[PDB]
Amino acid sequence: DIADLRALLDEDEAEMSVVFSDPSQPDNPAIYVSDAFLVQTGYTLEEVLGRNCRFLQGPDTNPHAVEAIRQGLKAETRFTIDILNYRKDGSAFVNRLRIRPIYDPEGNLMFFAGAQNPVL
Amino acid sequence: DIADLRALLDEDEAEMSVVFSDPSQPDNPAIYVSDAFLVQTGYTLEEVLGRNCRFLQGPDTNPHAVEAIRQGLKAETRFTIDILNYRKDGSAFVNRLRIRPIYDPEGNLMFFAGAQNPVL
Numbered sequence: 296d297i298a299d300l301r302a303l304l305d306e307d308e309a310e311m312s313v314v315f316s317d318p319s320q321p322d323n324p325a326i327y328v329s330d331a332f333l334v335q336t337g338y339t340l341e342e343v344l345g346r347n348c349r350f351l352q353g354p355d356t357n358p359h360a361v362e363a364i365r366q367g368l369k370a371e372t373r374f375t376i377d378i379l380n381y382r383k384d385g386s387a388f389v390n391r392l393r394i395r396p397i398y399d400p401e402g403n404l405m406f407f408a409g410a411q412n413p414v415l
Numbered sequence: 416d417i418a419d420l421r422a423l424l425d426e427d428e429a430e431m432s433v434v435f436s437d438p439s440q441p442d443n444p445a446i447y448v449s450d451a452f453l454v455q456t457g458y459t460l461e462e463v464l465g466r467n468c469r470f471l472q473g474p475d476t477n478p479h480a481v482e483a484i485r486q487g488l489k490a491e492t493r494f495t496i497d498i499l500n501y502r503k504d505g506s507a508f509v510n511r512l513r514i515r516p517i518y519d520p521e522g523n524l525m526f527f528a529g530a531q532n533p534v535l
């Protein structure tokens with residue numbers, strides 16, 4: 296029996312690029328990515344699961360945007376940022392990244408949900 | 416936004432006493448219990464969340480049954496055992512305990528689900 300993490304998706308994120316990360320594991324790795332995420336970024340599941348999502352950043356990603364995200368995660372609050380991201384073939388795209396914390400019944404942080412929308 | 420852990424319940428365990436535990440946390444604590452569990456055992460949510468479910472054991476619980484459960488958890492396999500358990504008022508009941516592991520998409524153990532059925 297495998298957990299149905301998609302059963303925590305918002306209605307918006309169902310047909311979307313979405314990632315869930317486990318902040319209790321070292322380096323806050325992705326434990327679930329939607330097929331839309333894999334299609335957009337050009338990776339296989341094996342290439343992404345268990346890694347921190349920073350692999351989407353590349354040579355022209357703004358490091359302050361990266362730090363903003365890191366602080367936003369520490370804040371455990373909903374936030375959105377436009378950040379330059381890259382696919383496996385090296386092509387770049389502006390990603391409107393939306394992140395929100397998910398807590399367990401006791402109120403302890405449990406997961407982060409991240410949704411990717413390329414800005415056209 | 417709070418995780419809907421009940422969205423991993425089997426159809427059988429919906430109207431049932433059920434617990435989910437987080438084995439990545441120290442001492443494998445309960446992170447979710449159903450209202451049926453609280454009613455049966457006589458505890459409040461605050462009294463149970465974040466504790467290992469061994470608080471259901473009492474003076475005449477068979478220690479080999481306890482060890483069986485512990486090994487079954489290490490085995491990460493489905494198992495069932497009849498074990499004497501106790502409510503908060505000290506009354507005892509024979510619990511047919513059914514436990515199953517739940518894994519994440521990478522196949523790493525993520526939760527245990529435990530269902531309680533008093534044997535009549």
Ligand SMILES: Cc1cc2nc3c(=O)[nH]c(=O)nc-3n(C[C@H](O)[C@H](O)[C@H](O)COP(=O)(O)O)c2cc1C
Nearest residue numbers: 314315316347348349351352361364365407408409
């Ligand atoms: C659920 C989740 C989804 C994320 N998605 C992206 C993303 O799509 N693009 C990106 O550049 N960073 C994303 N990140 C951010 C990185 O994983 C990381 O937190 C960021 O680089 C800042 O942390 P760092 O300083 O350790 O690198 C995501 C983080 C989380 C937790």
Ligand SMILES: Cc1cc2nc3c(=O)[nH]c(=O)nc-3n(C[C@H](O)[C@H](O)[C@H](O)COP(=O)(O)O)c2cc1C
Nearest residue numbers: 434435436467468469471472481484485527528529
């Ligand atoms: C999800 C879950 C549900 C459990 N439910 C019960 C239970 O209803 N009654 C009981 O005696 N033990 C239950 N246990 C077992 C105890 O939590 C514990 O694993 C057992 O006492 C053996 O471990 P120990 O040697 O550390 O005490 C449950 C364990 C898990 C993980």
